[PDB]
Amino acid sequence: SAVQQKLAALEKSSGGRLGVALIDTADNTQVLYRGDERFPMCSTSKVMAAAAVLKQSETQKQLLNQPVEIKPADLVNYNPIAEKHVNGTMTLAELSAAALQYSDNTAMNKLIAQLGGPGGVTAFARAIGDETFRLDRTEPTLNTAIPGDPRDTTTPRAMAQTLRQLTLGHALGETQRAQLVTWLKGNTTGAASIRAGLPTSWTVGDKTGSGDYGTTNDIAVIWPQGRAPLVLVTYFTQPQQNAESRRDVLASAARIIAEGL
């Protein structure tokens, strides 16, 4: 109840809409704030897409090594890794790593194309028991984050359960799960978000996202020192389209969640 009140006060002082889902896998206890409201996933959807290609690699041995042609025309709005390889090639493993750890949008589009389009990512979500996730568009338009728009959205509760199944459960094979966790732990973009609200001694693997309407997201699997892991989804979006990012709000939500643990 105190956590519910503090998250409501944080949201009230934030000027936006905050969604939080915590799963404590020590006892499966949950904490939800707007946990069943939809939020635009933005770059956090990349987790699903990479996991889906990892799932494909369970029945294609050499799929993650398969070269993919990077063309000049493939570049979109944020391609910090892919631009080095245009007119060249990247493997699907490199593309997955670039998408997850550097949030390369061209790499995400290559992952999406490897799955047959956004519906293939949604189909993977359905195949691992996620009924809420929907991916509808490619990069960059999946980040429009328009209020009330269900496209490219999920709920905090669904994303927390799914992230647990992908990183801690058995939605993926053991090697694929380990690769996904390795990728998440090497994220370069997460230090200002959930991780900033957690004690420094805790290991975090996470994927951030941001979009229009000041949309500021983070999804994390957290290994606290000396405790079983947590799954924490913090989604945040604001009323006006041009709003600035608010990673401090994600950090504050993580601090509130962390303090009740």
Ligand X SMILES: *C(=O)N1C[C@H](NOS(=O)(=O)O)CC[C@H]1C(N)=O
Active site residue: 14, 43, 45, 96, which one? 43
3-state secondary structure of 204: strand
CB of 13 to ligand X, least distance (A): 22
Cα→Cα distances 219→57, 82, 92, 260, Å: 23, 24, 22, 19
Q: Does 209 bind ligand X (CB under 6 A)?
A: yes
Contact call for residues 153 and 137 (beta carbons, < 8 A): no
Interface with ligand X: number of residues (CB under 6 A)? 13
CB 50: neighbour CB atoms within 10 A? 30
Q: Can 43 be counted among the known catalytic residues?
A: yes
Pick from 114, 153, 210, 234 the residue near ligand X by CB under 6 A.
210
Q: Nearer Cβ to ligand X, position 179 or 187?
A: 187
Closest separation in Å from C-beta 175 to ligand X: 26
Q: Identify the residue among 25, 113, 136, 140 touching ligand X (CB under 6 A).
A: 140
Q: Per-residue x/- marks for ligand X, 90-109, CB under 6 A? A: -------------x-x----
Quote the CA–CA distance of 231 and 171 in Å, as a whole number: 15
Question: What is the smallest separation between the CB atom of 26 and ligand X, expressed in angstroms?
Answer: 28
Least separation in angstroms between residue 217's CB and ligand X is 7
Least separation in angstroms between residue 244's CB and ligand X is 12
Q: For ligand X, which is the closer residue by CB, 4 or 188?
A: 188
Q: How many other CB atoms are there within 10 angstroms of residue 57's CB atom?
A: 22
The answer to whether 229 and 25 have CB atoms below 8 angstroms apart is yes
Candidates 7, 21, 42, 256: give the one binding ligand X (CB under 6 A): 42
The region, left, alpha or beta by phi > 0 then psi within -120 to 50, assigned to residue 5 is: alpha
The dihedral sign for the CA sequence 121, 107, 218, 168: positive
Output the CA angle 55-165-127, nearest 5 degrees.
50
Other C-beta atoms lying within 10 Å of the C-beta of residue 91: 15
Please give the helix or strand (H or E) that residue 70 lies within, else none: strand 67-70
Residues 144-173 that bind ligand X (CB under 6 A): none
Binding-site positions for Zn(2+):
139, 143
d(CA 121, CA 142): 13
User: Which of these segments, 7-15, 81-89, 159-167, 205-213, binds ligand X (CB under 6 A)?
Assistant: 205-213
Candidates 143, 167, 176, 238; binder of ligand X (CB under 6 A) is: 143
Binding-residue pattern over the window 222 to 251 for ligand X, x denoting contact by CB under 6 A: ------------------------------
Where does this chain bind ligand X (CB under 6 A)?
42-43, 77-78, 103, 105, 140, 143, 189, 208-211
